[PDB]
């Protein structure tokens, strides 16, 4: 037959690519006076109507472990945190010699030597004068430089870091990510998706759902639940050096408190600059804790062990242990509760060995004020004290496990909690999304000739 070349502009053809995605915020964040860390005025709010177009007879291949969509989010989250520590006070004159003594007024034995009462000399608004003030410090913030003994802050040989602005809040808010012109976002609507592999139900969305930037270790808090069963997702299930991401289907309610009420005392260290110290605790001194139900934790741990046997064998013994070692940020469950940073001991949660065939668990927690985040060296931040009693309620919606290893796979396998890089916390949310580039020009044979 007589066949000529005919061009078409606007064909539905796409290929994988990488780009820069902008925000989409809600109307609640449009009316803010106490500006959040993740606040607005940097990127546009959204429209109240999502646009989801279902694509039929389309099969696409996804891969959550090589997604560029989770590496831009980390950069954006780090960049929005350094942009809120600029306008408020830098605590450079705090690197002095501290004269600290123990406090034993109304303490209870474990809070024996956790709190320290320290006195020091501080500058005032006039350069010719100095003032003698005092403050309460935790034991995890002060070291000894060699009972009135001489102490110093733990950061005085690395950097002098800024105080946290006393008006901002650390409460996460949802953030939607949208695609630019010429690109598209593909969403996998399969219910038993496991990350790597083809997805037979693909739909096109305009912007993603609200992903709350919740920072936590060894446990995923306030996440998204599964729909059918628990999900175990790993890049390589045979390699023991890769973390295992478990997703729950029913939440486990965790609920913590800081029992003693503090008083915030303001100290003027310069012209227009203030330092918020700790005053006196009214009442008794008792430890902070977290409480998990003993019966609900059993149900959500007997289901993980059921689907962990589908990859390792039906006649193997699965054992749970606690973390091995490292610094305090990887061996403990760390989170933010109302402005105070907790470091809880999750050693009674994983204390079970499973055979093939009104009660609560109390987890002791510790509080710190000089913190280093995102594994960076030389940039700390001082969290000011919170006045009153703090209580928060959260949902546990997943775990980050790590297999130990060793031979004799059919005999025993031990799983212990993991943590570290925060890119695995946001990889559990952006696992069904993918960015593609539209290519609209193509040719095809047709019986149309020119010279009409």
């Amino acid at each position: 037959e007589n066949l000529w070349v005919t061009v078409y502009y606007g064909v539905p053809v796409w290929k994988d690519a990488e780009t820069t995605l902008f925000c989409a915020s809600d109307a609640k964040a449009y009316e803010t006076e106490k500006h959040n860390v993740w606040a607005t005025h940097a990127c546009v709010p959204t429209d109240p109507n999502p646009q989801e177009i279902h694509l039929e007879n389309v099969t696409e291949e996804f891969n959550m472990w090589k997604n560029n969509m989770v590496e831009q989010m980390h950069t954006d989250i780090i960049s929005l945190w350094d942009q809120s520590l600029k306008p408020c006070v830098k605590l450079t004159p705090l690197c002095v010699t501290l004269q600290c003594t123990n406090v034993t007024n109304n303490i209870t034995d474990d809070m024996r030597g956790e709190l320290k009462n320290c006195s020091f000399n501080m500058t005032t608004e006039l350069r010719d004068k100095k003032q003698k003030v005092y403050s309460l410090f935790y034991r995890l913030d002060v070291v000894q430089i060699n009972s009135n003994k001489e102490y110093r802050l733990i950061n005085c040989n690395t950097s002098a870091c800024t105080q946290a602005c006393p008006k901002v809040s650390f409460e996460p808010i949802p953030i939607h990510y949208c695609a630019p012109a010429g690109f598209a976002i593909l969403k996998c609507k399969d219910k038993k998706f496991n990350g790597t592999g083809p997805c037979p139900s693909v739909s096109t969305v305009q912007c993603t759902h609200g992903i709350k930037p919740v920072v936590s270790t060894q446990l995923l808090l306030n996440g998204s639940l599964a729909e059918e069963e628990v999900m175990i997702r790993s890049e390589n299930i045979t390699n023991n050096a890769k973390n295992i991401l478990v997703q729950f289907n029913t939440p486990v309610q965790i609920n913590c408190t800081r029992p003693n009420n503090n008083t915030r005392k303001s100290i003027r260290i310069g012209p227009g600059q203030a330092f918020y110290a700790t005053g006196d605790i009214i009442g008794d001194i008792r430890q902070a804790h977290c409480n998990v139900s003993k019966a609900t934790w059993n149900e959500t741990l007997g289901k993980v062990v059921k689907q962990l046997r589908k990859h390792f064998g039906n006649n193997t013994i699965i054992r749970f242990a606690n973390s091995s070692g490292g610094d305090l940020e990887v061996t403990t469950h760390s989170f933010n509760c109302g402005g105070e940073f907790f470091y809880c001991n999750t050693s009674g949660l994983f204390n079970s060995t499973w055979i093939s065939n009104n009660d609560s668990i109390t987890l002791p927690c510790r509080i710190k004020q000089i913190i280093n985040m995102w594994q960076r060296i030389g940039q700390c931040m001082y969290a000011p004290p919170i006045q009153g009693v703090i209580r928060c309620v959260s949902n546990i919606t997943g775990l980050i496990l790590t297999r130990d290893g060793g031979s004799t796979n059919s005999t025993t396998e031990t799983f212990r909690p993991g943590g570290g890089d925060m890119r695995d916390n946001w990889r559990s949310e952006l696992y069904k999304y993918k960015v593609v580039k539209i290519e609209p020009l193509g040719v095809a044979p047709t019986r149309c000739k020119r010279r009409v």
């Binding site: 037959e1 502009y9 606007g10 630019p180 012109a181 598209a184 096109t204 000739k449």
Partner: protein
């Protein structure tokens, strides 16, 4: 006869249809190519890169004989060594995504000297006009 918006296949809504049916929905994907310190330059750079990339396709359509047109046919012959197939198994049993991976390593020959035959149609036309 006034219009209902429910009969509207959206963006990429004909991506699973055959080639003969997805060819009537080109405007939907055609109109989306031109829509709208730190963290204020990368967006501007992306917008500038998106503007200069759409122009490189309109310039490529400037040559050949397809200017301001979405469906345009030329007079370049097709040999059987490109895709030996009938017209009843390309336009009725194949998707535009499946066609762009078969004719994928044969496109640079088509996009080049074979279709830039307008140079033989602009000098063959000004000579005719210079004869009265």
């Amino acid at each position: 006869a006034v219009g209902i918006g429910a009969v509207f296949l959206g963006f990429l809504g004909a991506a699973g249809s055959t080639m003969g049916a997805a060819s009537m929905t080109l405007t939907v994907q055609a109109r989306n190519l031109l829509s709208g310190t730190v963290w204020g330059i990368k967006q501007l750079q992306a917008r500038v890169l998106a503007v200069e990339r759409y122009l490189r396709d309109q310039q490529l359509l400037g040559i050949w004989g397809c200017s301001g047109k979405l469906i345009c046919c030329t007079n370049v012959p097709w040999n059987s060594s490109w895709s030996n197939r009938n017209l009843s198994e390309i336009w009725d049993n194949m998707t535009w995504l499946q066609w762009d991976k078969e004719i994928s390593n044969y496109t640079q020959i088509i996009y080049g000297l074979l279709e830039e035959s307008q140079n033989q149609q602009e000098k063959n036309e000004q000579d005719l006009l210079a004869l009265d």
